[PDB]
Amino acid sequence: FGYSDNHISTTKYNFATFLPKFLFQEFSKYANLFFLCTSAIQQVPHVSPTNRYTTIGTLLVVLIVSAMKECIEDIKRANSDKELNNSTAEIFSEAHDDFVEKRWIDIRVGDIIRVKSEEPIPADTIILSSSEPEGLCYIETANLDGETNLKIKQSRVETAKFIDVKTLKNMNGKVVSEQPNSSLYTYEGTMTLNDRQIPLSPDQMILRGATLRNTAWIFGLVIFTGHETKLLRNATATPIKRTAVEKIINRQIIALFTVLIVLILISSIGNVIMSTADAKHLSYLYLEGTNKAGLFFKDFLTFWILFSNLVPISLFVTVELIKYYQAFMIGSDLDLYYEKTDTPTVVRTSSLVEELGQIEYIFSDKTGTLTRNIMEFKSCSIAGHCYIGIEVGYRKFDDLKKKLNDPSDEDSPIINDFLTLLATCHTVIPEFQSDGSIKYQAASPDEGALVQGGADLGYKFIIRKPNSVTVLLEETGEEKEYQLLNICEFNSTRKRMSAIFRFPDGSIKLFCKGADTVILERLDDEANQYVEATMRHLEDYASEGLRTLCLAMRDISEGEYEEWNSIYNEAATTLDNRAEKLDEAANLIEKNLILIGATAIEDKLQDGVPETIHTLQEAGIKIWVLTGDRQETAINIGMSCRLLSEDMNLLIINEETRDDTERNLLEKINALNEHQLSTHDMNTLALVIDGKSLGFALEPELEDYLLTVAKLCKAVICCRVSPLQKALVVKMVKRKSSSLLLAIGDGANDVSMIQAAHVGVGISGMEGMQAARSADIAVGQFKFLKKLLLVHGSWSYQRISVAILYSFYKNTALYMTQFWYVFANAFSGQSIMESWTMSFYNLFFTVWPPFVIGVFDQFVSSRLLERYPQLYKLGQKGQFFSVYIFWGWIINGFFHSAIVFIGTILIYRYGFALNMHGELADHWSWGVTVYTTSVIIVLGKAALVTNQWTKFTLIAIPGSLLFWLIFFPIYASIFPHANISREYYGVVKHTYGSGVFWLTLIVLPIFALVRDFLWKYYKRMYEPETYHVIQEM
Amino acid sequence: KKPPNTAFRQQRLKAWQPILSPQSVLPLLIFVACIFTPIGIGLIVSATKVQDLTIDYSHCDTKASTTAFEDIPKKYIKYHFKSKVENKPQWRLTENENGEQSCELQFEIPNDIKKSIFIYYKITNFYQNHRRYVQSFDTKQILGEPIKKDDLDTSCSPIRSREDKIIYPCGLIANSMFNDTFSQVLSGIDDTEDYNLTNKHISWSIDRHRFKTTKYNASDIVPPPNWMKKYPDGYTDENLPDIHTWEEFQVWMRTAAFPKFYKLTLKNESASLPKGKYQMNIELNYPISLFGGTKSFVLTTNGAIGGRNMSLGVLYLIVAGLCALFGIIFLVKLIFQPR
Ligand SMILES: *[C@@H]1O[C@H](CO)[C@@H](O[C@@H]2O[C@H](CO)[C@@H](O)[C@H](O)[C@H]2NC(C)=O)[C@H](O)[C@H]1NC(C)=O
Ligand SMILES: *[C@@H]1O[C@H](CO)[C@@H](O)[C@H](O)[C@H]1NC(C)=O
Ligand SMILES: *[C@@H]1O[C@H](CO)[C@@H](O)[C@H](O)[C@H]1NC(C)=O
């Protein structure tokens, strides 16, 4: 009754429920809940060493930026939901006349709607009638199923007559329907239209996200709508995947919380030791608080607020702001954009841009991803002959001469029947066009390649009614009338399909095609005359990598057509098992055939695929390819798409139910005891598996048992694999021996395979769309994986690693001066700086140096990052970011921090460092002296860990220094006369008017960039690495 | 659709790259060391040019003389004059029952120091930078506003209120200030100068705008308990401290960063200090036992840095050493390593 709205449930918030869900999403984390609880402990009186509105202020700013990015992206989400939601819905008026143009929002229980062509269906409907007189309609499932076959949507016979507006005014009835479960091919419904029992089959089940293609209009009785359909109840939440860089951010923040509680234990235990030792000499504090453990608690909180900025607030919001901006920068790339299909390489998951830089086990679909899904009719093993260079395009004119020599050619009626089979027998639907040609609604691309392959020799298939005669368009003659008598459809275990046809002279013949191992067993072929040639030309087609079917025919007499018309007609009334009795019948007549020949359509490899697979294998990646193809054709594919180099090992495994231990254990023996050089044995290793052998291999009894031989090879190809074991391969490799994956597909059988990888990739373009939506990156062609993965993987991984690691450095290098001052004072908890430059440091001045490192830092140029794929191996193994390098950047923070503290202790010795008059540099003048010097060491280290850095980073690395040196007289001159920072009175005159303040800013930052600058010069001239050499090549 | 083809958008931005060839790192170290040697030498010149004097007078009451100018221990005086001191400085104690153990220090200036002279007091081991100590002053109540009870800044909490009265200079800074009163005159003995000082223009210019004379009726307020001794009857309409006029309160309120701090009391800038023997009389009111350490008085001048601190000059020399220590190691390792 009260149904929901028309939006795909990728929703994050609503306008009322924004606050508890978003604040639970941010405050379910650690580095925001920490500052929530320091801001909540900071409200205790006489405990805050800094302020209250400092930490709740910058935590509030971080929450506002997180709600800004989440608000923009969810408004873009709802903008797409308004691109789908606002759709024209002509709805029937019960009171007044014909279907009116309304919006979507007038759809309820049992609504009768008429929706037109070339526009999407609103929701689940039941067909009562359509523009066609039978009530069936033509539609395609762009959003539902992925298979592009236009469904023959049949309707109920007793309701098909209701067409006009006057018809369905006395038409209403209750429809007890199926429960809203997501069984796609199962329905149960009843109907009492005129107090008569009307059952409902799942055939009249136009679903939600379909687009009506070719009628004039369709009717629909809506059952379920909103989030109740069979497309919107199985809407996958797509749970977020924590990358390989942020699990170690989690334990990295655990490391900073460890060093924090070490600083507060050392510090506050020092406060108990000095505050109870120097009790005679600290009677000018009036410490008559008798609770010494109570003052240990209060002072413990003064240090838990005082050091609390060592963990940064504006890292995890800055990381997500950089990594989303890297996701923007990848999507706006000319070299990742294929303009023929016009797909602007969008990145669906912006949080996995880093994951492009550790990938070891790229998985792949062969059908359409590698092979483009364009079925070109290449060759045909015709009359037991082929081109034996390849000249089948020129040999096909000798096939035309084979037909045109009708007085003297034995093969000419046989090739008449050949072109008859690939001009008549199919399941595809013809389609008239505006041009002077015809285009085929291909229910099978093989069949459309056959019929268009006949159309290349002048066999234009004219439209064919399912219960009438048909005609053709022959090149030599004019027109020839054929007949649709009987069809015998294709099945998986049947491995063939046949048809019974009537030539116009009365000769009713059988015509059958299918695979070699079934059609090549029910045959005679005139005492096997054209069978050995058929075998050796199948093996020629299995030596070329072409999709190949076999062709045959036989005869039916009059009595066999009469009695077999009876057994075929009463054999086709079965609704119990439609695929069993019709195939037992459909091979009662498939004995002792006459073989004709074979067909061979090619599925051409795409534009950049072998170069891509070769350069990806040179980058240390173990590329796998998952397909449903057979052995020798896929070995020709991998031999042709650079998976299989010359004289590669090719561990063939074609096992059975319990044949596992022989090839598995004996290839463990030959994988271990046959120990070759293992450097040229490694790069010449492969594995070719049958998916039926792999079906009893992906199981917890024998999983790592297969992983020991699986991980050793360079390119593992799998053959004849059902689409469940794609996802079982992906989960199998991510569960044991946890490396960083990637999975590619372009079909709706790949969604369990793309949604399970460490980073999923879908392919747009051809008839699949479920992959490019349910991915992490949508990609035009497989060639884009090379520059995207190598180039933008190395770029994104290095830049985000030095951005994160630098951010930990800069916060350590500021607030570690707050720790070294605990020894200078009475272990008290005195903030060196004023309260608000604390909150302007990690939010307002040093927020731009991590950004331009995280985005605008070319550590090695892309023109020689893909001319040396070996460089991708150094990002892959786990360089540039660890816990060891993390403590290198922390202890660089301790050395630079203590050199600023100790250096500025010894410069401002007694406070007496002024030459203006006899006045002295107080607490706060020294405080902004160590603050300013710590800024110059921090963007000094930022200026030393950048490379290829001019444009938007000279606005950031010197822009933060000059922006602080301009901000500080403005803030500390204007703002102390506002009762907000009453600690900066005269600090501008006693620092910027000082003689010795700028001297400290000149030399003392250099005195840490000696270790920084000379370590950098040492490890790229005298102890270089690979990329240090390649940066000048 | 098609993304644009600007130089920014396609990661093709114009970029110079710092290459660390030894043709651009060795002139950087030679240039940095060769530009930090004249300024390090120049600032050790302008950090040894000053001629200070520093006499610890903490042990003048128990280590006393009380009858004549006896000699001082060597461990107290740290003089750094240009010329050499002929007669080592003496001191004595006096007690006229009103001064209460005033201390006549007597020092010998060896040559006439020409720069403006400044007399400080150094206090060691006085944590003026405690967390409970740079707070604990009501900012409104030192602005002169008659702030009532319970409207005060609560950071003054132990020195905030008394017997149904408020303390006008509340809190930990205003209480327990350095109340040893220096003599305004360097008394030139044996007829040399009889040298005058001032305690005017001593504090910060912004403290002399922020510290204003009060507006209380002088009967609701009470002095803080340590210098309750100088106001034994309490605050009255006559003896009330004008904070804008006092100008030694507002050098003690401006809290220094460290436990080892100077604080300015006296100076002279319009006349030189001649080369005679001087004495200075220091009324010992402030006990040692309150804080922990020493309390000297300092008679210093100024240089480029403030007084005698060679640490920034030698802190340029460590940089100009380590940019010519590795600027030679990275040239010996540039010639002899590909040798
Ligand atoms: C100088 O200051 C000291 C401490 O700041 C004062 O000594 C205190 O005086 C009061 C009142 O006589 C006593 O109750 C305290 O016990 C003293 N504290 C000590 C001795 O540590 C001293 O009175 C001041 N001298 C003046 C104002 O002339
Ligand atoms: C400086 O000393 C001379 C001589 O003792 C004196 O005349 C002059 O007034 C003093 N100046 C100040 C500002 O105290
Ligand atoms: C200068 O010193 C003499 C010495 O007794 C003193 O009387 C006089 O007041 C001083 N002048 C000032 C401080 O202006």
Numbering used by the authors:
A (entry chain A): 196 to 583, 597 to 1241
B (entry chain E): 21 to 359
Task: Please share text taken word for word from the publication where this structure appeared.
The yeast lipid flippase Drs2p-Cdc50p is primarily found in the trans-Golgi network and is involved in protein trafficking between that network, the plasma membrane, and endosomes. Drs2p belongs to a large family of Type IV P-type ATPases (P4 ATPases). These enzymes translocate specific phospholipids from the extracellular side of the plasma membrane or from the lumenal side of internal organelles to the cytosolic side, creating and maintaining lipid compositional asymmetry in eukaryotic cell membranes. Drs2p-Cdc50p is activated by the binding of phosphatidylinositol 4-phosphate (PI4P), the Arf guanine nucleotide exchange factor Gea2p, and the Arf-related small-GTP-binding protein Arl1p to the C-terminal region of Drs2p9,10.
